[PDB]
């Protein structure tokens, strides 16, 4: 019961970044993207019209994560600076300004993801993940246990649990409320560079630098499926699921996104077209578009 | 469609400022300083530490990190500056390990490395006194002979430490990137202009390959 060939193709090109793109996030409206690049700018794209909606200058040009608040009001970014910045988009003054600069991490920030518009969970290279209250700027909860840099985060659909990936080659699942590790299974041979949740919250897929992905479920305590081919020996930079999981889009350092069949573990397609390592990859909320950013400075919308 | 066309004006307005800002975020040369611990990193001029400087009206922006894996972010820099004091031995082989890890890193194979052999004074005075023997740590040094006021005693040893680093360089790279060794003292003002000359070579070399003259 395969899915044949998913001959997806470019439908837009969101040109405008002057440097390497590192992260983007789809707004809940399924229209607005926020993209972060080393140029030092956050650009709010209107995918439908290829229109730039906001441009947000940043204090630190070394961004490595970005987020779009589910309410659509706030966007967050993080990077080598140990401060996570929350920006307010619906300012009555018209311009976007910072609301809180979340200091407190000992190392670089690798992933940030809002939570119900008032709590933001971030992971840093100092081997810690943290949950914050944006208003006060304090760490409501601190997560420890990694033996290395934490590189990626993914919020569950319910937002009660979130998973982290670190360079210790283990995937750690955490509780926002209970504040201690629930699962820490391992199995990768190298750094876990990216993490994403399956739409049901019971699974998440790991992207590792050993050129192999793995599909984990909390009940299994082990990898269920592993995605790799002998002709691909480059690390995975980003991962995102499809609206029903079938279409596991994954970014690779070889300048193309391998479109893996989540259930079948077969390379059912390739969204080639990028001139450099494809870094970030995200599917819309409605499942109607997959936006792919790369170090080529181009964001492409595929359908 | 009147309101939607007004959004196009805002979209093109943003692109105008991005390229306006993108013409000054370029034309400055990013540099990464990966000197080893207990060295003269801060002498030759948030988690990230920056030090801007400019010679001949070219703006340099050097970056340091106190808090391996983030190195992938720096595959655009003009060069990497690896600073090691040439006076210690118990971690000099450790310093050579550090250089190899940078020279052979996947994302750095297109990046030249400027190597600063700082604290030559300490090495010069140290071997001149001879209170400790190099051969105890580098037995192969006993076979070395020089290839070139000026002291001929320690200069025999001075080029050995450079020889050790350059040997790690020519063993790989294959012309995609080059290692530019240097000797310096932590009083010298020449540290700034050495990098300027060295980045001109790196930039000139980059043109030679992307314009098909090599």
């Amino acid at each position: 019961d395969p899915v044949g060939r998913i001959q997806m193709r470019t439908r837009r090109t969101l040109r405008g970044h002057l440097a390497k793109i590192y992260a983007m996030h789809w707004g809940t409206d399924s229209r607005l993207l926020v993209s972060a690049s080393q140029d030092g700018k956050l650009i709010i794209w209107d995918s439908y019209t290829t229109n730039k909606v906001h441009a947000i200058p940043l204090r630190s040009s070394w961004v490595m994560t970005c987020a779009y608040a589910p309410s659509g009001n706030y966007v967050a970014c993080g990077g080598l600076d140990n401060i996570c910045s929350i920006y307010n988009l619906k300012t009555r003054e018209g311009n976007v300004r910072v609301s809180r600069e979340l200091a407190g991490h000992t190392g670089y920030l690798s992933c940030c993801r809002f939570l119900d518009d008032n709590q933001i969970v971030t992971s840093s290279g100092d081997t810690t993940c943290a949950l914050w209250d944006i208003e006060t700027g304090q760490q409501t909860t601190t997560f420890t246990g990694h033996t290395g840099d934490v590189m990626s985060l993914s919020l569950a659909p319910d937002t009660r649990l979130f998973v982290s990936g670190a360079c210790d080659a283990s995937a750690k699942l955490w509780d926002v409320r209970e504040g201690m590790c629930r699962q820490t299974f391992t199995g990768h041979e190298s750094d876990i560079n990216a993490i994403c949740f399956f739409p049901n919250g019971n699974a998440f897929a790991t992207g590792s630098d050993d050129a192999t992905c793995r599909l984990f479920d909390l009940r299994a305590d082990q990898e269920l499926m592993t995605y790799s081919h002998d002709n691909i020996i480059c690390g995975i930079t980003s991962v995102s699921f499809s609206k029903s999981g079938r279409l596991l889009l994954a970014g690779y350092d070889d300048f193309n996104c391998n479109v893996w069949d989540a259930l079948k573990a077969d390379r059912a397609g390739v969204l080639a077209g990028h001139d450099n390592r494809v870094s970030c990859l995200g599917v819309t909320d409605d499942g109607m578009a997959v936006a792919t950013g790369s170090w080529d400075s181009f964001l492409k919308i595929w359908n | 469609s009147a309101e939607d066309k007004a959004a196009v004006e805002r979209s093109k307005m943003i692109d105008r400022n991005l390229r306006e800002d993108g013409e000054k975020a370029r034309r400055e040369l990013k540099l990464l300083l990966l000197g080893t611990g207990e060295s003269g990193k801060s002498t030759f001029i948030t988690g990230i530490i920056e030090y801007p400087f400019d010679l001949q009206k070219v703006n340099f922006h050097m970056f340091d990190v106190g808090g391996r894996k983030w190195i992938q972010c720096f595959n655009d820099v003009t060069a990497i500056i690896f600073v090691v004091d040439s006076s210690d031995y118990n971690r000099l082989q450790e310093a050579l390990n550090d250089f190899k890890s940078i020279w052979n890193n996947r994302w750095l194979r297109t990046i030249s490395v400027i190597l600063f052999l700082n604290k030559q004074d300490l090495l010069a005075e140290k071997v001149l006194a001879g209170k400790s023997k190099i051969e105890d740590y580098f037995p192969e040094f006993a076979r070395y002979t020089t290839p070139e006021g000026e002291d001929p005693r320690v200069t025999r040893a001075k080029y050995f430490i450079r020889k050790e680093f350059v040997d790690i360089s020519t063993a790989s790279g294959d012309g995609r990137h080059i290692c530019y060794p240097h000797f310096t003292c932590a009083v010298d003002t020449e540290n700034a202009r050495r990098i300027f000359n060295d980045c001109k070579d790196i930039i000139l070399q980059m043109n030679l390959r992307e314009y098909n003259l090599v």
Partner: single-chain antibody, 233 residues
Framework: DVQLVESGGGLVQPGGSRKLSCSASGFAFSSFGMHWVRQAPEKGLEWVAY????????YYADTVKGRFTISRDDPKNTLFLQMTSLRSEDTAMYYC??????????????WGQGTTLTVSSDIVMTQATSSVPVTPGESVSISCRSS???????????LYWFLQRPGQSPQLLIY???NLASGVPDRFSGSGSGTAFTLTISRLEAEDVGVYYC?????????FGAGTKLELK
């Protein structure tokens, strides 16, 4: 907070000329486009001119085209409108209005207090409910009609609703036919389809009294209906 104050009005002798000035304060006026709007003393509203965020596009009302000259000075957060020659029908109140256009925008969010310039010596919006008595606790609903369907294929519908309370500048109630603007209580909501539309209110409050106004902003010129004056009793 946001605030726009304008001046330059006053009585004008026959054959004169005047410049209205709108001084923005407390917001990124450079990022907003500017509109001028007119209200006759007892004969409804009327659009005047338009200058965009970046003076790449300009528009004027037919009754003033050429005579007027809309100008802005972004670095000083000031807007102008140079008026050339004089005509008796120019007698009316003028208002300064801000609008910023991006996907989720709410054009016409803020209005100045206006400056009087009384003188002495295109799609059509319409609403049959010129005036109606109302009492507290009712759920009165107003209606306005269009000469062309406003549902452009985008799904956008550029009909607007405002409230010019007594002695007060208009405040944006519903933008793009259904959307609730900033500072507007939950009481208000626009609904319908196609060409005629209902601005519904529940639990009418004493502050919900004045003269409502409906305009269609599919394309320039912009046109007003006579509005709806509410007599509270």
């Amino acid at each position: 907070d946001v605030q726009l104050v304008e001046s330059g009005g006053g009585l004008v002798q026959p054959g004169g000329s005047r410049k209205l000035s709108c001084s923005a304060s407390g917001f990124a006026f450079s990022s907003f486009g500017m509109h001028w709007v007119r209200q006759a003393p007892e004969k409804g509203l009327e659009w005047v001119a338009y200058i965009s965020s970046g003076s790449g596009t300009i528009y004027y009302a037919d009754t003033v085209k050429g005579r007027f000259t809309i100008s802005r000075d972004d670095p000083k957060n000031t807007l102008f409108l140079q008026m050339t020659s004089l005509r008796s029908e120019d007698t009316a109140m003028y208002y300064c209005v801000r609008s910023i256009y991006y996907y989720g925008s709410s054009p016409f969010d803020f209005w100045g207090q206006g400056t009087t310039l009384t003188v002495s010596s295109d799609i059509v919006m319409t609403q049959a409910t010129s005036s109606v008595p109302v009492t507290p606790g009712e759920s009165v609903s107003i209606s306005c009609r269009s000469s062309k369907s406003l549902l452009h294929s985008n799904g956008n519908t550029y009909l607007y609703w405002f409230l010019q309370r007594p002695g007060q500048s208009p405040q944006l109630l519903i933008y793009r036919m259904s959307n609730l603007a900033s500072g507007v209580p939950d009481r208000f909501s626009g609904s319908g389809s196609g060409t005629a539309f209902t601005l519904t209110i529940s639990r009418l409050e004493a502050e919900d009294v004045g003269v409502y106004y409906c305009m269609q902003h599919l394309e320039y010129p912009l046109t007003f209906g006579a509005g709806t004056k509410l007599e509270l009793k």
